[PDB]
Structure formats: structure tokens, C-alpha cells
Coordinates of C-alpha atoms and ligand atoms in Angstrom, one line a residue:
Chain V
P25 CA 2.5 -23.1 110.4
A26 CA 2.3 -20.6 107.0
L27 CA -0.6 -21.2 105.0
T28 CA 0.0 -22.4 101.4
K29 CA -1.4 -21.2 98.1
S30 CA -4.1 -23.7 97.5
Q31 CA -5.2 -23.3 100.9
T32 CA -4.9 -19.1 101.2
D33 CA -7.3 -19.8 97.6
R34 CA -9.9 -21.8 99.7
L35 CA -10.2 -19.6 102.2
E36 CA -10.4 -17.0 99.5
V37 CA -13.4 -18.4 98.1
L38 CA -15.3 -18.6 101.7
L39 CA -14.2 -15.5 102.0
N40 CA -16.8 -12.5 102.1
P41 CA -15.8 -8.8 101.3
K42 CA -17.4 -7.7 104.3
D43 CA -15.3 -10.6 106.5
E44 CA -12.2 -8.8 108.8
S49 CA -2.6 -14.0 111.8
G50 CA -2.7 -16.9 113.9
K51 CA -5.0 -19.8 113.9
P52 CA -4.5 -23.1 111.4
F53 CA -5.9 -24.0 108.0
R54 CA -8.4 -26.2 109.4
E55 CA -10.0 -24.3 112.2
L56 CA -9.7 -21.0 110.0
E57 CA -11.9 -23.0 107.2
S58 CA -14.2 -24.0 109.8
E59 CA -14.6 -20.5 111.0
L60 CA -15.8 -19.4 107.2
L61 CA -17.4 -22.3 106.4
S62 CA -20.3 -21.8 109.1
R63 CA -20.2 -18.0 108.7
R64 CA -21.2 -18.7 104.7
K65 CA -23.9 -21.5 105.9
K66 CA -25.2 -19.0 108.0
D67 CA -25.3 -16.0 105.1
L68 CA -27.4 -19.0 103.0
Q69 CA -29.6 -19.8 105.7
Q70 CA -30.6 -16.3 106.2
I71 CA -30.9 -15.6 103.1
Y72 CA -33.5 -18.5 103.0
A73 CA -35.2 -17.6 106.0
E74 CA -36.1 -14.0 104.9
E75 CA -35.1 -12.9 101.3
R76 CA -35.3 -16.3 99.2
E77 CA -33.7 -13.7 96.4
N78 CA -31.3 -14.0 93.5
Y79 CA -28.9 -10.9 93.1
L80 CA -29.0 -11.0 89.8
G81 CA -32.9 -11.4 89.1
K82 CA -33.7 -9.0 92.0
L83 CA -31.3 -6.4 89.9
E84 CA -33.1 -7.4 86.5
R85 CA -36.1 -6.6 88.2
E86 CA -34.6 -3.1 90.0
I87 CA -33.5 -2.1 86.6
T88 CA -36.8 -2.9 85.2
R89 CA -39.2 -0.7 87.1
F90 CA -36.8 2.1 86.4
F91 CA -37.2 2.3 82.9
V92 CA -40.8 1.3 83.1
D93 CA -41.1 3.3 85.4
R94 CA -39.1 6.2 83.4
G95 CA -41.5 5.1 80.5
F96 CA -39.3 2.9 78.6
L97 CA -41.2 -0.5 76.9
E98 CA -39.9 -4.0 77.9
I99 CA -38.6 -5.8 75.3
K100 CA -37.9 -9.7 75.4
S101 CA -36.3 -10.5 72.2
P102 CA -34.8 -14.2 71.0
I103 CA -31.5 -14.9 72.2
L104 CA -30.4 -17.1 69.4
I105 CA -30.2 -14.8 67.0
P106 CA -29.7 -15.4 62.7
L107 CA -25.9 -15.2 61.9
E108 CA -26.7 -12.6 59.8
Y109 CA -27.0 -10.0 62.6
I110 CA -23.5 -9.8 63.2
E111 CA -22.3 -9.0 60.1
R112 CA -25.1 -6.6 59.7
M113 CA -24.2 -4.5 62.7
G114 CA -20.8 -4.1 60.9
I115 CA -18.7 -6.9 62.6
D116 CA -15.9 -8.2 60.4
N117 CA -13.1 -9.6 60.9
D118 CA -11.7 -6.3 61.5
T119 CA -13.0 -6.3 64.9
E120 CA -12.6 -8.5 67.7
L121 CA -15.7 -9.7 68.1
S122 CA -15.6 -11.1 64.6
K123 CA -14.2 -14.0 66.9
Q124 CA -16.0 -14.1 69.9
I125 CA -19.1 -15.1 68.9
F126 CA -20.7 -18.8 69.7
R127 CA -21.7 -20.0 66.3
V128 CA -25.0 -22.4 67.2
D129 CA -25.7 -24.1 63.7
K130 CA -24.7 -22.4 60.3
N131 CA -27.6 -20.3 60.3
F132 CA -27.4 -19.0 63.7
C133 CA -25.5 -17.7 67.1
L134 CA -25.9 -16.2 70.6
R135 CA -26.4 -13.1 70.8
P136 CA -23.4 -11.0 71.7
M137 CA -25.3 -8.3 72.1
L138 CA -29.0 -6.5 72.4
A139 CA -28.5 -3.7 69.2
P140 CA -29.5 -5.9 66.3
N141 CA -33.3 -6.7 67.8
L142 CA -33.4 -3.2 69.2
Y143 CA -33.0 -1.7 66.0
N144 CA -35.6 -3.7 64.8
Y145 CA -38.2 -3.0 67.3
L146 CA -37.1 0.8 67.2
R147 CA -38.4 0.6 63.0
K148 CA -41.2 -1.2 63.4
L149 CA -42.6 0.2 66.5
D150 CA -41.8 4.5 64.8
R151 CA -44.9 3.2 62.6
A152 CA -47.4 3.0 65.6
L153 CA -46.3 5.0 68.5
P154 CA -45.3 8.6 69.7
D155 CA -42.1 10.6 69.8
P156 CA -40.4 9.5 71.0
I157 CA -40.2 6.2 71.4
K158 CA -38.3 5.0 74.3
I159 CA -37.0 1.2 74.8
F160 CA -34.9 -1.3 76.8
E161 CA -34.5 -5.0 77.4
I162 CA -32.3 -7.0 80.1
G163 CA -31.0 -10.3 79.5
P164 CA -28.6 -13.4 78.9
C165 CA -25.4 -12.5 76.2
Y166 CA -22.5 -14.3 74.9
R167 CA -18.9 -13.2 73.8
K168 CA -16.1 -15.8 74.3
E169 CA -13.5 -14.7 76.5
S170 CA -9.5 -15.0 77.3
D171 CA -10.0 -12.5 80.5
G172 CA -11.6 -13.7 83.1
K173 CA -11.5 -11.3 86.6
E174 CA -13.7 -9.0 84.8
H175 CA -15.3 -10.7 81.7
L176 CA -17.5 -13.7 81.8
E177 CA -18.5 -15.6 78.5
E178 CA -21.8 -15.8 79.3
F179 CA -23.7 -12.4 81.1
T180 CA -26.6 -10.4 81.4
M181 CA -27.1 -6.9 79.7
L182 CA -29.2 -3.9 79.9
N183 CA -29.8 -2.0 77.2
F184 CA -31.9 0.9 76.8
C185 CA -32.9 3.6 73.9
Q186 CA -34.6 6.7 73.1
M187 CA -35.8 7.9 69.1
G188 CA -36.8 11.1 68.1
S189 CA -37.2 14.1 70.2
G190 CA -35.0 15.1 73.2
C191 CA -32.6 12.7 71.9
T192 CA -29.5 15.1 73.0
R193 CA -25.9 13.8 75.2
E194 CA -27.5 16.2 77.8
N195 CA -30.1 13.8 78.5
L196 CA -28.5 10.5 77.9
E197 CA -25.9 11.8 80.8
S198 CA -29.1 12.6 82.8
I199 CA -30.7 9.3 82.2
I200 CA -27.4 7.1 82.7
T201 CA -26.8 9.1 86.1
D202 CA -30.4 9.7 87.4
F203 CA -30.4 5.1 86.8
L204 CA -26.6 4.8 89.0
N205 CA -27.8 7.0 91.5
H206 CA -30.7 5.2 92.0
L207 CA -28.6 1.7 92.6
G208 CA -25.8 3.6 94.2
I209 CA -23.2 2.9 92.3
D210 CA -20.0 5.6 92.0
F211 CA -19.0 6.5 88.2
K212 CA -17.6 8.9 85.7
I213 CA -18.5 9.7 82.1
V214 CA -15.7 10.3 79.3
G215 CA -16.3 11.0 76.2
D216 CA -15.2 14.2 74.5
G222 CA -22.1 10.8 66.7
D223 CA -20.5 10.6 69.7
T224 CA -19.1 7.9 72.0
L225 CA -19.2 8.3 75.3
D226 CA -18.0 5.2 78.7
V227 CA -19.3 5.1 82.7
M228 CA -16.2 3.6 83.9
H229 CA -16.3 3.2 87.8
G230 CA -12.2 3.4 88.5
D231 CA -10.5 1.8 85.9
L232 CA -13.6 -0.4 85.0
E233 CA -16.1 -0.2 81.9
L234 CA -20.0 -0.3 83.4
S235 CA -20.9 1.1 79.9
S236 CA -20.9 2.3 76.5
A237 CA -22.8 4.8 75.6
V238 CA -23.8 6.5 72.2
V239 CA -25.3 9.9 70.7
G240 CA -26.3 8.8 67.2
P241 CA -27.9 8.8 64.3
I242 CA -24.7 6.8 63.3
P243 CA -23.9 5.3 59.7
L244 CA -25.2 1.6 60.6
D245 CA -28.4 2.9 61.6
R246 CA -29.5 3.1 57.6
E247 CA -28.6 -0.7 57.2
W248 CA -31.7 -1.0 59.8
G249 CA -33.9 1.2 58.5
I250 CA -33.6 3.7 61.2
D251 CA -33.0 7.6 60.2
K252 CA -33.9 9.5 63.0
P253 CA -31.8 10.9 65.9
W254 CA -31.7 8.7 68.7
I255 CA -29.3 7.9 72.3
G256 CA -29.1 4.5 74.3
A257 CA -26.3 2.6 76.3
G258 CA -25.5 -0.7 77.5
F259 CA -24.8 -1.8 80.9
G260 CA -23.4 -5.3 82.2
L261 CA -25.9 -6.5 85.5
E262 CA -23.3 -8.7 86.8
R263 CA -20.4 -5.8 86.9
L264 CA -22.8 -3.6 88.1
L265 CA -23.3 -6.0 90.8
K266 CA -19.4 -6.8 91.2
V267 CA -19.5 -2.8 91.6
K268 CA -22.5 -2.9 94.5
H269 CA -21.2 -5.9 96.0
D270 CA -17.5 -5.4 95.9
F271 CA -17.0 -9.0 95.2
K272 CA -13.5 -9.1 94.3
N273 CA -14.1 -11.4 90.7
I274 CA -17.3 -11.0 88.0
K275 CA -17.5 -15.2 88.9
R276 CA -19.1 -14.6 92.1
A277 CA -22.0 -12.3 90.5
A278 CA -23.1 -14.8 87.8
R279 CA -25.1 -17.5 86.9
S280 CA -23.1 -19.9 88.3
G281 CA -23.3 -23.7 90.0
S282 CA -20.3 -22.2 92.2
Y283 CA -21.8 -18.9 94.1
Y284 CA -25.6 -18.3 95.4
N285 CA -25.5 -14.5 96.1
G286 CA -21.6 -14.4 96.6
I287 CA -22.3 -16.8 98.8
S288 CA -19.7 -19.8 97.6
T289 CA -22.1 -23.2 97.4
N290 CA -19.2 -25.4 98.4
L291 CA -19.6 -25.8 101.7
Chain D
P25 CA -65.1 -10.6 46.0
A26 CA -63.9 -13.2 48.3
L27 CA -60.9 -13.2 50.2
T28 CA -57.9 -15.5 49.3
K29 CA -56.1 -17.3 51.6
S30 CA -53.1 -15.3 52.1
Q31 CA -55.1 -12.3 52.5
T32 CA -57.0 -14.2 55.8
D33 CA -53.7 -15.1 56.7
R34 CA -52.7 -11.8 56.8
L35 CA -56.2 -10.1 58.5
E36 CA -55.0 -13.2 61.0
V37 CA -52.0 -12.0 62.0
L38 CA -53.5 -8.5 63.0
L39 CA -56.6 -10.4 64.9
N40 CA -55.9 -10.8 68.1
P41 CA -58.7 -12.9 70.5
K42 CA -60.6 -10.6 71.9
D43 CA -61.8 -9.3 68.0
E44 CA -65.2 -10.2 67.1
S49 CA -68.4 -10.4 56.2
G50 CA -68.9 -7.2 53.9
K51 CA -66.2 -5.2 52.7
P52 CA -63.2 -5.8 50.9
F53 CA -59.1 -6.6 52.4
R54 CA -58.1 -2.9 51.7
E55 CA -60.5 -1.8 54.5
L56 CA -60.5 -4.9 56.9
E57 CA -56.9 -4.9 57.3
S58 CA -57.1 -0.9 57.7
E59 CA -59.4 -1.6 60.2
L60 CA -57.3 -3.9 62.2
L61 CA -54.9 -2.4 61.7
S62 CA -54.9 0.9 63.8
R63 CA -57.0 -1.5 66.7
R64 CA -53.4 -2.6 66.4
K65 CA -51.9 0.9 66.2
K66 CA -53.9 1.2 69.0
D67 CA -53.4 -1.5 71.6
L68 CA -49.7 -1.2 71.4
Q69 CA -50.3 2.8 72.5
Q70 CA -52.6 2.4 75.2
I71 CA -49.4 -0.4 76.4
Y72 CA -47.3 2.3 75.6
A73 CA -48.9 4.7 77.6
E74 CA -49.9 2.9 80.8
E75 CA -48.6 -0.4 81.5
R76 CA -45.1 -0.7 79.2
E77 CA -44.9 -4.6 80.4
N78 CA -43.5 -7.1 78.5
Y79 CA -45.7 -10.4 79.1
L80 CA -43.6 -12.9 79.6
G81 CA -41.4 -10.9 81.8
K82 CA -44.2 -10.1 84.1
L83 CA -45.8 -13.5 84.3
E84 CA -41.9 -14.1 84.8
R85 CA -41.9 -11.7 87.8
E86 CA -45.6 -13.0 88.8
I87 CA -44.4 -16.7 89.1
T88 CA -41.1 -15.7 91.4
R89 CA -43.0 -13.9 93.7
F90 CA -45.5 -17.1 94.5
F91 CA -42.7 -19.6 94.8
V92 CA -40.3 -16.8 96.7
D93 CA -43.2 -16.4 99.5
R94 CA -44.1 -19.5 99.2
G95 CA -41.0 -20.1 100.8
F96 CA -38.5 -21.1 97.5
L97 CA -35.2 -20.1 96.9
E98 CA -34.5 -18.3 93.7
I99 CA -31.8 -19.8 91.5
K100 CA -30.4 -18.2 87.9
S101 CA -27.8 -20.8 86.9
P102 CA -25.8 -21.0 83.7
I103 CA -27.9 -21.4 80.3
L104 CA -25.0 -22.5 78.7
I105 CA -24.8 -25.6 80.3
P106 CA -21.3 -28.6 79.9
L107 CA -22.7 -31.3 77.6
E108 CA -21.8 -34.3 80.0
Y109 CA -25.2 -33.2 81.8
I110 CA -27.2 -34.3 78.8
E111 CA -25.5 -37.9 79.3
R112 CA -25.5 -37.6 82.7
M113 CA -29.5 -36.6 82.8
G114 CA -30.3 -40.5 81.0
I115 CA -30.6 -38.9 77.3
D116 CA -29.0 -40.8 74.7
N117 CA -30.0 -41.7 71.3
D118 CA -32.9 -44.0 72.7
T119 CA -35.2 -41.1 73.6
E120 CA -36.2 -37.9 71.3
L121 CA -34.4 -35.5 72.6
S122 CA -31.1 -36.8 71.5
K123 CA -31.5 -34.5 68.5
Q124 CA -33.7 -31.9 69.6
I125 CA -30.2 -30.0 71.6
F126 CA -28.2 -27.4 69.9
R127 CA -25.0 -28.1 70.5
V128 CA -22.6 -25.3 71.2
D129 CA -18.7 -26.1 69.8
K130 CA -17.8 -29.4 71.6
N131 CA -17.7 -29.2 74.9
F132 CA -21.2 -27.9 75.2
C133 CA -25.0 -27.1 74.3
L134 CA -28.4 -25.0 75.6
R135 CA -29.7 -26.4 78.4
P136 CA -33.0 -28.2 77.0
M137 CA -34.5 -28.3 80.5
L138 CA -33.4 -27.0 84.0
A139 CA -33.4 -30.1 85.7
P140 CA -29.2 -30.9 85.6
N141 CA -28.6 -27.5 87.5
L142 CA -31.4 -27.8 89.4
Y143 CA -29.8 -31.1 90.6
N144 CA -26.8 -29.6 91.5
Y145 CA -27.8 -27.0 93.6
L146 CA -29.7 -29.8 95.5
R147 CA -26.9 -31.4 96.0
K148 CA -25.0 -28.4 97.2
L149 CA -27.6 -26.4 99.5
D150 CA -28.3 -29.5 101.3
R151 CA -25.0 -28.8 103.4
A152 CA -26.1 -25.8 104.5
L153 CA -30.0 -25.8 104.6
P154 CA -32.9 -26.9 106.6
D155 CA -35.2 -29.5 106.0
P156 CA -36.9 -29.2 103.5
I157 CA -34.8 -27.5 100.8
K158 CA -37.1 -25.4 98.2
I159 CA -36.2 -23.9 95.0
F160 CA -37.1 -22.7 91.5
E161 CA -35.8 -20.8 88.0
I162 CA -37.3 -19.2 85.5
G163 CA -35.2 -18.9 82.5
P164 CA -34.3 -19.8 78.8
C165 CA -34.6 -23.2 77.4
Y166 CA -33.7 -24.7 73.9
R167 CA -34.6 -27.4 72.1
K168 CA -34.8 -28.9 68.2
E169 CA -38.5 -28.7 67.0
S170 CA -40.6 -30.0 63.8
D171 CA -43.7 -28.5 64.7
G172 CA -44.8 -25.1 65.7
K173 CA -48.4 -24.3 67.4
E174 CA -47.6 -25.5 70.6
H175 CA -43.3 -25.6 70.5
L176 CA -41.2 -22.7 70.1
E177 CA -37.2 -23.9 69.6
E178 CA -36.5 -20.7 72.0
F179 CA -38.6 -20.7 75.4
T180 CA -39.4 -19.8 78.6
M181 CA -39.1 -22.5 81.7
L182 CA -40.4 -22.5 85.4
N183 CA -39.0 -25.6 87.5
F184 CA -39.3 -26.0 91.0
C185 CA -38.8 -28.3 93.5
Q186 CA -38.6 -29.6 96.9
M187 CA -36.2 -32.0 98.6
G188 CA -36.8 -33.9 102.1
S189 CA -40.3 -33.8 104.2
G190 CA -43.2 -33.2 102.9
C191 CA -42.5 -34.6 99.0
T192 CA -46.0 -36.3 98.5
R193 CA -47.7 -36.3 95.9
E194 CA -50.9 -34.7 98.0
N195 CA -47.9 -32.0 98.2
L196 CA -47.0 -31.7 94.7
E197 CA -50.3 -31.8 93.9
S198 CA -51.5 -29.1 96.0
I199 CA -48.6 -26.6 95.1
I200 CA -49.7 -27.3 91.2
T201 CA -53.1 -25.9 92.2
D202 CA -52.7 -23.6 93.9
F203 CA -49.9 -21.7 91.8
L204 CA -52.7 -22.2 88.6
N205 CA -55.8 -21.1 90.5
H206 CA -53.2 -18.0 91.9
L207 CA -52.5 -17.4 87.2
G208 CA -56.5 -18.3 87.0
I209 CA -55.4 -21.2 84.4
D210 CA -57.6 -23.8 84.1
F211 CA -56.4 -27.8 84.2
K212 CA -56.1 -30.8 84.6
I213 CA -54.0 -33.8 86.6
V214 CA -53.2 -37.1 84.9
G215 CA -51.3 -39.9 86.3
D216 CA -51.8 -43.2 88.0
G222 CA -41.8 -42.9 91.8
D223 CA -44.5 -41.1 89.7
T224 CA -45.4 -38.9 86.7
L225 CA -48.1 -36.8 86.9
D226 CA -49.0 -34.3 84.1
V227 CA -50.9 -31.1 83.9
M228 CA -53.2 -30.6 80.9
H229 CA -55.3 -28.1 79.9
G230 CA -57.7 -29.8 77.2
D231 CA -55.1 -31.4 75.0
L232 CA -52.7 -29.2 75.5
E233 CA -49.7 -30.2 78.4
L234 CA -49.3 -27.5 80.6
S235 CA -46.4 -29.3 82.9
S236 CA -45.2 -32.8 83.9
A237 CA -44.1 -33.7 87.2
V238 CA -42.4 -36.1 89.6
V239 CA -42.8 -37.6 92.7
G240 CA -39.2 -38.7 93.8
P241 CA -36.8 -40.4 94.7
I242 CA -35.8 -42.1 91.4
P243 CA -33.1 -44.3 90.1
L244 CA -31.5 -41.1 88.4
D245 CA -31.0 -39.6 91.4
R246 CA -27.7 -41.7 92.0
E247 CA -25.9 -39.7 89.4
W248 CA -25.8 -36.4 90.8
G249 CA -26.0 -37.1 94.2
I250 CA -29.0 -36.9 95.7
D251 CA -30.6 -39.9 98.1
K252 CA -33.4 -37.8 99.6
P253 CA -37.2 -37.8 98.7
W254 CA -38.0 -35.0 96.4
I255 CA -41.0 -33.6 94.6
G256 CA -41.6 -31.6 91.5
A257 CA -42.7 -30.3 88.5
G258 CA -41.9 -28.1 85.3
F259 CA -43.9 -25.8 83.1
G260 CA -43.6 -24.1 80.0
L261 CA -44.2 -19.6 80.7
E262 CA -44.8 -19.5 76.5
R263 CA -47.6 -21.7 77.2
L264 CA -49.1 -20.6 80.2
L265 CA -49.4 -17.6 78.2
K266 CA -50.8 -18.8 75.0
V267 CA -54.0 -20.3 77.7
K268 CA -54.3 -17.5 79.7
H269 CA -54.3 -15.3 77.0
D270 CA -56.4 -17.0 74.8
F271 CA -53.9 -17.2 71.2
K272 CA -54.0 -19.7 69.0
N273 CA -50.7 -20.1 68.6
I274 CA -47.9 -20.2 70.5
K275 CA -45.4 -17.6 67.9
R276 CA -47.9 -14.8 70.1
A277 CA -46.1 -15.6 73.6
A278 CA -42.5 -16.0 72.5
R279 CA -39.9 -13.9 72.8
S280 CA -40.1 -12.2 69.1
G281 CA -39.9 -9.2 66.5
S282 CA -42.8 -10.1 64.9
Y283 CA -45.5 -9.7 67.8
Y284 CA -45.4 -8.0 71.3
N285 CA -48.0 -8.9 74.2
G286 CA -49.7 -11.2 71.1
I287 CA -49.7 -7.9 68.9
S288 CA -48.1 -7.9 65.6
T289 CA -45.3 -5.6 65.2
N290 CA -46.3 -5.6 61.0
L291 CA -48.4 -3.2 60.9
Ligands
LIG1 N1 -18.1 -10.4 78.9 C1 -18.2 -9.4 80.0 N2 -18.5 -9.6 81.0 C2 -19.3 -9.1 81.5 N3 -20.1 -7.5 81.3 C3 -20.1 -7.4 80.4 C4 -18.8 -8.4 79.3 N4 -19.0 -7.5 77.9 C5 -19.4 -6.6 77.6 N5 -20.4 -6.2 79.1 C6 -20.6 -5.0 79.5 O1 -21.3 -4.8 78.5 C7 -21.0 -3.2 78.5 C8 -20.3 -2.8 77.4 O2 -20.4 -3.4 76.9 P1 -19.3 -3.9 75.3 O3 -18.7 -2.2 74.8 O4 -19.8 -4.7 74.3 O5 -18.2 -4.3 76.0 P2 -16.7 -4.1 75.5 O6 -16.4 -2.7 74.9 O7 -16.9 -5.1 75.0 N6 -15.7 -3.6 77.1 P3 -14.8 -4.8 76.9 O8 -15.0 -6.5 77.4 O9 -14.0 -4.4 79.2 O10 -13.0 -4.2 76.1 C9 -20.4 -2.6 79.7 O11 -21.9 -2.8 80.6 C10 -19.7 -4.3 79.8 O12 -19.3 -4.4 81.1
LIG2 N1 -40.7 -26.2 72.6 C1 -41.3 -26.0 74.1 N2 -42.6 -24.6 73.6 C2 -43.6 -24.2 75.0 N3 -43.1 -25.1 75.8 C3 -42.5 -26.4 76.0 C4 -41.5 -26.9 74.9 N4 -40.9 -27.3 75.2 C5 -41.5 -27.8 76.8 N5 -42.0 -26.8 76.9 C6 -42.9 -26.5 78.5 O1 -42.0 -27.3 79.4 C7 -42.9 -28.4 79.9 C8 -42.8 -29.8 79.9 O2 -41.7 -30.7 80.1 P1 -41.1 -31.4 79.3 O3 -41.9 -32.7 79.7 O4 -39.6 -31.8 78.8 O5 -42.5 -31.8 77.5 P2 -42.4 -32.8 76.8 O6 -42.0 -33.9 77.1 O7 -41.0 -32.3 75.8 N6 -43.9 -31.9 76.1 P3 -44.1 -32.2 74.6 O8 -43.0 -31.5 73.5 O9 -46.1 -31.7 74.2 O10 -43.9 -33.5 74.0 C9 -44.4 -28.6 79.6 O11 -44.6 -26.5 80.7 C10 -44.0 -27.7 78.5 O12 -45.4 -26.9 77.9
LIG3 MG1 -14.2 -6.8 74.8
LIG4 MG1 -17.2 -0.6 75.2
LIG5 MG1 -41.5 -32.5 73.3
LIG6 MG1 -44.0 -33.9 79.1

């Protein structure tokens, strides 16, 4: 008769964005199951590349080509960096942190080590210094429609000449027109927000900023952080952020429970 | 006069593999410091790519081209997977584990999720099933000349037809001749060891294996795990594994303390 809520939830899991009443649950399920099996078969026959990995690689050629240096820093950082990042029980990120042992934790962001790389590289590189990093980041979350506790972050930045907000926005714009993601910047050192509809695609800043001193920076800098899973959720039009996440439940948005 | 042990340790840090008595410490230090600064400047002027990332990308094109499916699974896995992997206080890996909260931990290896992917994909993919994954792995270690507590693992495998040890060795051999790494396999289901001199480059297995059942496998399979940092330490001839690790201390083997 009418599909139950549970059968609906099930059919949605097998339902891809691009898909388009009458038959019972058993057949509708069977129709989707063969469709999904066919998609996986096609992926395996030709492409064989994972979305996350593919994006990370396209994002990387993008910044490397535009002159940024590719950084791969630790994911398991000293807990101290969280304090030194100006994150006390004052902010939300306070408990959002996955503590490992007593002296470590899971980098909830890329800033700490990108700061370190800027201080150190200034002693050897011409102006301006341009660097980026793409990688695993962690934050405990209560929601789960746009938040994953384990996700991938892209953080790029420049220090020295050219660190103007006109330029920061120009990188943000070339970037996203390259990926093919509609966006809107919103602001008023500075703090911008790159939004996709009601979804935060990125928060960027134009420094210097007071914190800069705690890391030994002291120069003008520009920069921004984007979530790879969110860029994916937009590009592929997935209803839930889970379809673009590292998972044992979906591959390139296709359910693995067939 | 004679260099102290400390000055020596310092000069070694600035010393690259390819470099080749007389002057005092101050000048020798100054000579190396400009050399390193020049290398970083060259990297930044032309390449701009990180070793780890670059390797991961070359390894990836390799397996994808040879028909393997690229997997990106979670790094923060359920603690249960460690028990189900047959790791009790019986083995060394018992305490080598970084526990996160009470139900999680840091994947000390790729097996758990590759097993899951094999069970699930069998329901949709032709024979044989070929998949791989490259990514962060964690184990507490006492040593540190060939062991990093945070490192990168490459795990590839096949299930079904063709899972012969003659084939496993053939993949291992094409792989390494492609990267340009001298090696030697040593064995006698099976367990092989790919060594570089006295260094373990990889441990491989030819299943089925008894464990296979706990993950719902039940088919013949072949496979192996390599450390990206170790492959790097060999290719670039770094004296210590720290030079190829994710770090705030070295970039492509060049010290960042200039
Ligand atoms: N849990 C998450 N899952 C996916 N992406 C995230 C997550 N947390 C942050 N990001 C991304 O990181 C960039 C923003 O960083 P940040 O300013 O730390 O987020 P926030 O301010 O925590 N945003 P929000 O969680 O929506 O209130 C954007 O690309 C976000 O999509
Ligand atoms: N801590 C580590 N640092 C770098 N590579 C590692 C580390 N642990 C394992 N590997 C790599 O993973 C592959 C072997 O996996 P595994 O069999 O778990 O190592 P093991 O048996 O722990 N070897 P070992 O630590 O030398 O006694 C090889 O490529 C190793 O170089
Ligand atoms: Mg938040
Ligand atoms: Mg924000
Ligand atoms: Mg060991
Ligand atoms: Mg071994």
C-alpha cells in the first residue's frame, strides 16, 4: 500500500541525486539496487578514483600551479597548540576536541602548523610566502546533516606583499569557478564567509590579527579554510554530508549496502 | 678545534644525503645553512610538491591504472575492530594503540576497513575484486630510527581469481621497479616479507587465512602493506625516518630550522 517511514529511509539510501507512485517496496528496492550495482560496476570499469582523493588532487594542482607550497603536517598535534590558538572554555571548540593521551589531540584545524611553517619559511623564502595543506581534521559534533566528526580540510594562505582582501577574494573566486561551485562571500583584521545558499563553505581572514604574535608572525597575511566534504556535498548535490565522507557506508555517494 | 658532539648533531641536521676536516663550526654551519635555504628556494620556484603527497599520488596512479579501486576509509575506527583483528594482550600491538574516548582509536593499520570493503563490494563487482588505500596510521613506538608514531600506509589487495603467490610477488615487483627501490622478498596461508637490506619494507599475505571468517570473507585473496615513509627513506637515502615524516621539522628532507 503506502510505504512505511522505514522503507522510505531505505529507498533514500539507495537513491542517487540524479534519479527521477505505483509499485510496492520490494520492486522499487530491487530497481534501485541494480542501479547502484551498475554505477559501482561502471566506476570500477573505467574511473576507479575516489571522490575525496580526486578532489584533494585537483585542489592540489590548483594551488601548486598558482604558486603555493604543498604542506603535509602532523594530524596528531600537541594539545598546547589548542590553548595557543586562543581556544579556552570561552569558545565552542573547547570540548569539541578529541584528546589523545594527556599531551596530545586531533588537530581540529590546520592553523597551528601552517603558522609554524610561515614563521620558519620566512627565514628562507622570497616575498610573499605562499603555502597550503589538505588533510584530516577532527571535531566532536552534535549535528550530522552538514557536520562530520572526521573530515577533510583545505587551508591556503599567503604572507607579505599582496595580502589584500581584494586578492583573497580573487583566489576564492578563481578557486570555486574552477571547481564549478556557486558561492557568495559575506563580510563587512577582517573575517569573510563564503556561503553556498545557507551553507558555510568557508571562513577566511585578512590579517594581521592579534593572535599572530603568539606564533611569531608579525607580517600581513591573507587566507581561508574550506571543507572538502562540503564542497563535494554541493558539487554532487548529496542531501547529507555523510555521502562524501570517509566511510564504510558509501563510495562516491553510492551506498555500499547492496 | 674539534667539533663537539652537539655541533656535530647540529651540522648533521643541516646535512643532506647528497652532500660531500678544516674550518670551524661557525663557517661549516653557515655553509650548510645557505645550501639548505637554496634548496627550499628551488623547491618553491619550480616543483612546490611535498614528497609524501607526491608519492601517495604516484602510488595511486599506479594501482588505479593496474585496475585497483581507490578507497578512502575512516582513520578514527571503532575500538572493536582491534579486538576483531585478533589483537589481544597476546601481541605487541596490544598497547601500541592510541585510544580515543572509550569506543574509538586510531587505526593502527588498514585491514579492518579493507576487509569491510571486500565483503560489501563482492555483492556488486565482477571477479576478482581489486582495491587499495593510502593513508594515516598510528602506533605507539619506543624506537625512532625506522619507526614514527604517526605514519602513512599503502595497503593493496585482490580477492577471487588470480590470488596466487606468484601474482602477489609480481605486483610487488612491478610496483617497486616502478618507484626505483631495490628489494628482496623472503618467505618459505603464506606470509612474505619485502626487505631493503635489513629494513622491512612490507609484510604480505596469501590467504585465505582463519581471520577471514570474522569479517565475512571466505574467498581466496592476496595482498600487502607498505610504509610510505620507509619507501621514501630508501629512495632519498635519509639516515633517519623523521626526514620523510609529516613534520614541522623537515620539508622534503630539508631542515626547516634555518
Ligand atoms: N565538522 C565539519 N564537517 C565538515 N566540514 C567542516 C566541519 N567543520 C568545519 N568544516 C569546514 O571548515 C570550514 C570552516 O571552518 P570553521 O570556521 O572552523 O567552521 P565553523 O566555524 O566551525 N563552521 P560551522 O561548523 O558550520 O559553525 C568550512 O569549509 C567548513 O565547511
Ligand atoms: N611505525 C612505523 N613507521 C613507519 N612505517 C611503519 C611503521 N609501522 C609499520 N610500518 C610499515 O608498514 C609495513 C609493515 O606493516 P607491519 O607488519 O604492521 O609492521 P611491523 O610488522 O610492525 N614491522 P616493524 O615495526 O619493523 O616490526 C611496512 O611498510 C612498514 O614499514
Ligand atoms: Mg562549528
Ligand atoms: Mg566559520
Ligand atoms: Mg612493530
Ligand atoms: Mg611485519
